[PDB]
Amino acid sequence: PAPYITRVATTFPVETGTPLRIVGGNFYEIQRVYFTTAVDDITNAPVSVEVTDYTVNKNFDEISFNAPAGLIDEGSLVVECYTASAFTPFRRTALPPSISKVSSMMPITGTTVTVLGQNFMDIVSITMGNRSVDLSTVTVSEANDMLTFTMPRAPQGTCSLAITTMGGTAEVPGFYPLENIVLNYDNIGWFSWGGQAVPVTADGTAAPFFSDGKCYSISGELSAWNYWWGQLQNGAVWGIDTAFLPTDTPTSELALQFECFVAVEYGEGPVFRIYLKGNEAHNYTNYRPVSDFTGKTEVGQWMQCSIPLSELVDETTWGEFQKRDGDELALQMTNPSENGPYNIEMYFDNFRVVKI
Numbered sequence: 169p170a171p172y173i174t175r176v177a178t179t180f181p182v183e184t185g186t187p188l189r190i191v192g193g194n195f196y197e198i199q200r201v202y203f204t205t206a207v208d209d210i211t212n213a214p215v216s217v218e219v220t221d222y223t224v225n226k227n228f229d230e231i232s233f234n235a236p237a238g239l240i241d242e243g244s245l246v247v248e249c250y251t252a253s254a255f256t257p258f259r260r261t262a263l264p265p266s267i268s269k270v271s272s273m274m275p276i277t278g279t280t281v282t283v284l285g286q287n288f289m290d291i292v293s294i295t296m297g298n299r300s301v302d303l304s305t306v307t308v309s310e311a312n313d314m315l316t317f318t319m320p321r322a323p324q325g326t327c328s329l330a331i332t333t334m335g336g337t338a339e340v341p342g343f344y345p346l347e348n349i350v351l352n353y354d355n356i357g358w359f360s361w362g363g364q365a366v367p368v369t370a371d372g373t374a375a376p377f378f379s380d381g382k383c384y385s386i387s388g389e390l391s392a393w394n395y396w397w398g399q400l401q402n403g404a405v406w407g408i409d410t411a412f413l414p415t416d417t418p419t420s421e422l423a424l425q426f427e428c429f430v431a432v433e434y435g436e437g438p439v440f441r442i443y444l445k446g447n448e449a450h451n452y453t454n455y456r457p458v459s460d461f462t463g464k465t466e467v468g469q470w471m472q473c474s475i476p477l478s479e480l481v482d483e484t485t486w487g488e489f490q491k492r493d494g495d496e497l498a499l500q501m502t503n504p505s506e507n508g509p510y511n512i513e514m515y516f517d518n519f520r521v522v523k524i
C-alpha cells in the first residue's frame with residue numbers, strides 16, 4: 169500500500185525546533201522527508217529543506233520530527249517512500265478561523281450548537297455578546313472544520329457569535345435576534361386556538377428536554393386521509409423595533425424563522441401549511457420542517473427552520489406588511505394521503521422575522 173498524509177500536528181507559528189507530527193498511514197521504507205516550495209504536484213519537486221532526523225511509530229502511521237532551520241514559509245511537506253510519495257500543504261503560520269454555517273441563530277440554552285468553518289485549531293474562546301462558552305463542552309473535528317458546544321445562558325439581544333483562536337477571530341453578526349421575535353409564547357404574542365396543541369415547558373426529563381420558556385406542541389395520532397387535524401393559530405406581535413428591521417426592507421430579503429423539535433420521525437403524507445394575517449390565498453403549503461443547517465429533519469434535536477417571507481406575504485416591503493390588518497401567525501398540519509396512521513410529536517418556539 170502507498171503512503172498518505174491525513175494531517176500534520178504542530179503548534180503555530182512553526183519555528184526552528186518546533187515539533188511536528190505527520191499523521192497518515194503506510195509509512196513503510198521511508199527514504200526522505202522534506203519541505204518543498206512545490207504545491208499541487210510534487211513530480212521533480214525540489215528538496216527545499218530536508219528533515220534528516222525523524223522517528224516513526226510502531227504502526228507506521230505517525231512521523232515525528234523537529235522543524236529544521238531555514239524553514240520555508242509555505243509549500244508542501246513530503247514523505248518519499250519506496251512505493252510512492254505522499255504530500256500535504258504546509259505553511260508556517262496559522263490562518264484566521266472562518267465560519268461558514270451555524271446550526272441555529274437562536275440556539276436554546278443547554279442544547280448542542282454545531283458550527284462549520286475552517287482553521288478551528290487552538291481555540292481560545294467562543295463568545296456571543298456578553299456570554300462565553302464553557303470550553304469543556306467544545307469538541308472540534310480532526311480537520312478543524314467543525315465544532316460543537318453547549319449553548320450557554322442566552323445573550324440579551326442581537327450580537328455577534330465569535331470564535332477566537334490563536335490565529336484570529338471569526339464573527340457572525342445578527343446572532344441571537346431576540347428583537348426580531350414575533351411570537352415566543354412567553355412575553356411576545358399568544359396562542360389563540362388549535363387542534364392537537366398543548367403548551368410545554370421543558371425541565372430535562374422529557375422531550376423537547378430543553379425549552380426557551382413555554383413552547384407549543386402538536387402531537388397525537390394522525391390518520392390517513394385527514395384534511396383537518398392539528399393547528400397552532402397564534403397572535404403575533406409584528407412591531408419589530410426599526411433599529412433591528414428597517415421599515416423599507418424588501419420582503420424578498422426576509423424570512424419567517426423558528427425553532428422546531430421533531431420528537432418522532434414520520435413518513436410521507438403529513439404536511440404543514442403556514443399563513444400570516446389570515447392571507448390563506450398566499451399560504452405556503454406542503455411543508456416538512458427541515459433544518460436550515462442540514463436540509464433534513466433532525467429527529468430529537470431543536471432545528472432552525474426558515475421560510476422566505478415572500479412565499480407568505482403579498483406585500484413588497486416589511487412596512488407594508490406591518491400595515492396590513494390582522495395579526496395571526498398560523499400553522500396547520502394535515503395528512504392528505506393514503507399513508508398512516510402516524511404518531512406525531514413536535515414542538516415550536518421563537519418565531520422571528522429576519523434578513524436572509
Ligand SMILES: [Ca+2]
Nearest residue numbers: 352380381382
Ligand atoms: Ca418560548
